[PDB]
Symmetry: C3
Subunit: 266 residues, 3 copies
């Protein structure tokens, strides 16, 4: 059933997606799921052992590799982590269903915790390029919603305070910030960046909030972690060259992947 | 002709809709129309004597009973109130046309007065669950408009001071506020609520402004009445539980319906 | 290939448009392009000699005359200015592709400079109807983007400082301001206008920022100039009558056409 055909039940496609994953990986259920965003592609390498790789295009509802990872905990029990292959942005024009399909598919596999990551611009000068930041809340500015009916979900604590405390048990120095989602793909003008600050954002980017909303609706607990690609337009007096942004991003690789691995164990 | 098809003239469907109503009800023209939002469902029981009921799905352009009520005034004169059967929200994705069809239809029956009610979240701590609030102005945050083409409607006084003054005759204590409309169906996070306050809203909800813009365009006089379902996210340190909100909503029922009934007679 | 079909490549239609123009006008390439907004219809009559007029509906992708003008410079050299036909607005419902097609056609003829003009509402009382204002930056509030993929374009200086310097050589008294685009077609309510000032806007309208984004993606230097049609709702304690607004705009005609004529020669 095509996800973009309005008559299709997106959750039925999620179910079929999960089933496909259960039999292609041999894992009956996953416990947590991760979405690797810009700057986070190598960040799942230290998480544990890869149990299976599933070309994403072969999973119902999508269209590079989805990974099933076994995570060893302190007490010897294990966890299965679903690492989603790639991510669909609103600016690709495929509709909001394709954007949150990965999240609904993860919840259908039985996952309870969702770790959303992204690359983004920061409005706070203390957080230079390469700095990871925990999301405390968000402002969705895309004028779009992933929910399609009379939906009763409370979004008072989208980003689980429980998980934010855990992250702080792992690294007490991570700051927290409100993230604003712009439709994109073009970046914000200095006036739009001042606008976001006046509205209460510390970070701007192009994803995550619709995924968080869909996660909550499916009852997932959410941990959001941004990597500041660099300071947003007009924030820095002397803005970083593109080469500099890339290098600062690279050099954050080890830290960032050690953080997800430690967090995945709790 | 399907309201859906871009070629179709929405106003001609509304014309057919009024003609059907006049014929099905026996009432050649209506004087006022009421749209009952969340929590206002039975608020039209004291309006007057039901003259007719029309299965809404049988009226051109719709797809629940629409009622024609005889309102009896002080000086024995009578008015006919059109109580529209259903309401189509923007978040259902049926297009902005289906959202304002009821308003354009009321205009075509010749009802010059439109009473728009809704349920919303309040930002003012003085207005707890159950408080009816008069709309003094609005902020449309849906990035949508019900008008197609070069239709330059002046929205300087969308909500008629004249009608607010009459509302104050029935209850001089009613407060007034600026309502902000988000696309929905989800509610706002505490950060979005704070943003709404910064922008100047006192109330947040998910309907009404598109309807109010189309009403003006048709030359209707509009009364907007919001029912605070409860304080919005992060406004109260002591949030009411879902059961309490429902209960508070039920208890306002009587007050609320006496209010419309009195306002309807003027 | 209809621009309308998602499959069509917009830029290929732009190429066709441009080859068509070069042929119909005999001008191999143009150097600059101008879009005349509301209040600017007669402001290109002093630009230079009209080399050719092309009915717009005849150029690939459009659907009321486009003109190729010869600009004689001080040193005896010449330039060819492409003066675009009307302008397609977002509120017309034909999609973002149709809105920025003129800009991409211009780029395709080789133009390196784009002058965008519009008529807008002002929020600064020091700028009465008739005041032309240079655009220093903008705030796009339509929740749309003309870019279709990971088009990672920098908007840190959408409105060229070079061009604002030159405009200032012609008339050093021109002020600069931040422009906010609303989808329209309805005008803003006094609450919405207050909202725009809180967000940092000095001017509100319904066009331009999408065209500006598409122009910068194509590498054009952009000059934006607004003509305040009048004060936005609630700004003026004393609202101008229609007669006044119209007369203020006509009184501005000479000043505006002289401005572009002088700028066009640099
Ligand atoms: Ca009448």
């Amino acid at each position: 059933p095509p996800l973009d055909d309005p008559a299709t039940d997106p959750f039925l496609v999620a179910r079929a997606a999960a089933d496909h994953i259960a039999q292609a990986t041999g894992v009956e259920g996953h416990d947590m799921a991760l979405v690797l965003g810009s700057g986070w592609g190598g960040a799942a390498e230290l998480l544990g052992e890869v149990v299976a790789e599933v070309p994403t295009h072969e999973i119902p509802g999508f269209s590079s590799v989805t990974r099933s990872i076994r995570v060893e905990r302190a007490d010897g029990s294990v966890r299965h982590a679903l690492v989603l292959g790639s991510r669909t942005h609103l600016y690709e024009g495929k509709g909001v269903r394709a954007v949150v399909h990965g999240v609904r598919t993860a919840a259908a596999t039985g996952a309870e915790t969702l770790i959303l990551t992204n690359g983004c611009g920061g409005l706070n000068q203390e957080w230079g390029a390469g700095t990871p930041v925990l999301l405390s809340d968000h402002i969705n500015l895309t004028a779009r919603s992933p929910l399609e009916g009379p939906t009763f979900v409370d979004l008072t604590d989208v980003y689980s305070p429980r998980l934010r405390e855990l992250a702080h048990r792992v690294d007490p120095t991570l700051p927290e910030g409100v993230y604003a989602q712009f439709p994109g793909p073009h970046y914000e003008t200095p006036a739009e960046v001042r606008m976001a600050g006046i509205l209460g954002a510390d970070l701007v980017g192009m994803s995550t909030t619709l995924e968080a909303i869909a996660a909550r609706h499916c009852g997932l607990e959410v941990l959001g972690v941004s990597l500041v690609t660099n300071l947003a337009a007009g924030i820095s007096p002397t803005p970083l060259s593109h080469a500099e942004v890339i290098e600062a991003g690279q050099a954050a690789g080890p830290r960032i992947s050690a953080l997800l691995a430690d967090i995945a164990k709790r």
